[PDB]
């Protein structure tokens, strides 16, 4: 068994009647899993903020399966609409990128495989990662590097960045990479900036603290937070909340899960992965 | 599933040719769940320090299961015993004491139904609650209160304690907690001195420190801790351990589990309950 499939799923407590949000659908993996074990009367709301995975979402044909296009930011208000606030059995997110989205060069996501300077989950709307930094300030991108990709070098990067692009405008994932790695001295030079410039292209973090905030307002009691966090970055968020909301009272903490050396072998990139477990009291 | 059993066994990792130890066999719940797990060049070695402990693991039928009378404490030594040092693959504690300790009165373990006023989980040597309580100094028992029991009153009980013994000796469970409910104003007044009190005979803390202590050299690389806590002043213990020892580099920490709402109503001794698994490293 894993932390990242077999435990996640453990955590939302499953009964066969109950109500359940996969908040991160993702190719259906947590989803399927979580259907699996529903009976009839069981339900299962999905979301997912990139069209493709809305287009695998679709092809499910199960009436007690639906799919949500957008954030998982707005889950509050997804609930609202279908009047189930407070009848949430439990909430999965399992976080960050898919695999399609890491893997189809063309979404822009890799320093690797050149493709379109994109990086969005959803590039249905808002701005791609190449009008970012064709219009920002150097010290907007160099404080995105600092805090989102924890690069030393964001100053001189960031200046880098803007020069390129006052010359001669970056549009591809690849002379992106290029200029990071002249930029720094000398693992691969640009990783931290793809990952501090996927992160503000996304919001992930702040999507992630909005969620968070939200389950709490919608889950019935004893209803439960799975949540799998991809790095650092995610599970500082994720920790800080279940702390700040189980000390004294509206949710109780009931633990955290990384995976061993098999597993991460098994997975090179469940790596720093952490899965946290809380549930909803009656307060 | 449950944390107490399900997730316990998870977190050994089991492969089908590795060396496991249950260090607290009980009644063999554990023991039977990692067996049937093993192939058949996987080995099982248990230990208990309760006489009928050995009775019940005796009638296992498995060349691959041994088991060992003793305490957990001597962990290393047993290993060595058998030239299994650095060959142990996982390590399960499930700690405190075992339900036939808790529902046989003669045992001695309860102020709710009259026994020998015993307590020792190994009743073939050592001291008795009633000896120690017999000879000790107020100080003393009032030390193990506060400690062992988090009793607020200890001073005033182990002062009551020590005149008793004085004028008429103590000899059964029922006079202990008559002379603790006296001693206090007025839950019921006597379980946190029977919880101290137990602890003493036991050295149950001691015990679970040198277990941990002794894993360390055990353990095969890649081998696992799966430590089951029941109440906060072991799990104290734990944490610390795991704590100290994977910062930096010994041990990885894997994280910690706790039952949900329905587990704890299911069972409502697993109340407090805290299962912490960690592995070996290269170290
Ligand atoms: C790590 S994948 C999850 C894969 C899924 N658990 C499975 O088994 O196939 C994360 C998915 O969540 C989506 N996602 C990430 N952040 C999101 C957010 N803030 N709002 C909506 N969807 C998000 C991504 O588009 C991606 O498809
Ligand atoms: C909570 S019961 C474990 C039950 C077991 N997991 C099962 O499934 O049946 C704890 C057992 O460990 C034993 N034990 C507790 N502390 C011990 C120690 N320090 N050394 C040896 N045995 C110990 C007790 O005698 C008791 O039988
Ligand atoms: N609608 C939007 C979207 C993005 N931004 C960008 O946010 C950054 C603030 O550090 C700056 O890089 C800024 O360009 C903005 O100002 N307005
Ligand atoms: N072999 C032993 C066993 C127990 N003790 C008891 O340990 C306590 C120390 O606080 C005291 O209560 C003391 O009686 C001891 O001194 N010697």
Chains 1, 2 share one sequence.
Do not use: C
């Amino acid at each position: 068994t894993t932390v990242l499939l077999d435990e996640a799923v453990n955590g939302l407590n499953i009964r066969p009647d109950g109500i359940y949000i996969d908040g991160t659908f993702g190719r259906g993996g947590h989803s399927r899993l979580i259907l699996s074990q529903l009976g009839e009367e069981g339900r299962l709301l999905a979301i997912d903020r990139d069209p493709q995975a809305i287009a695998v979402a679709k092809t499910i044909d199960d009436p007690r399966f639906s799919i949500i296009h957008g954030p998982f930011s707005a889950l509050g208000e997804y609930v609202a609409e279908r009047d189930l606030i407070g009848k949430i059995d439990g909430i999965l997110l399992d976080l960050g990128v898919s695999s399609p989205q890491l893997d189809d060069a063309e979404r822009g996501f890799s320093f690797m495989r050149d493709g379109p300077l994109d990086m969005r989950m959803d590039p249905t709307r808002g701005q791609s990662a190449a009008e970012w930094l064709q219009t920002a300030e150097e010290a907007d991108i160099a404080w995105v590097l600092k805090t989102y990709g924890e690069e030393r070098f964001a100053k001189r990067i960031a200046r880098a960045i803007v020069e390129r692009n006052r010359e001669q405008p970056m549009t591809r994932t690849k002379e992106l990479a290029e200029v990071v790695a002249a930029a720094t001295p000398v693992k691969h030079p640009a990783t931290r900036t793809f990952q501090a410039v996927r992160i503000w292209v996304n919001s992930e973090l702040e999507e992630i603290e909005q969620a968070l905030k939200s389950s709490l307002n919608v889950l019935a009691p004893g209803g439960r937070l799975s949540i799998i966090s991809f790095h650092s970055l995610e599970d500082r968020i994720v920790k800080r909340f279940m702390r700040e909301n189980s000390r004294g009272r509206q949710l109780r903490a009931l633990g955290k899960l990384m995976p061993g050396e098999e597993e991460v072998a098994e997975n090179p990139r469940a790596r720093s992965s952490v899965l946290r477990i809380a549930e909803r009291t009656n307060a």
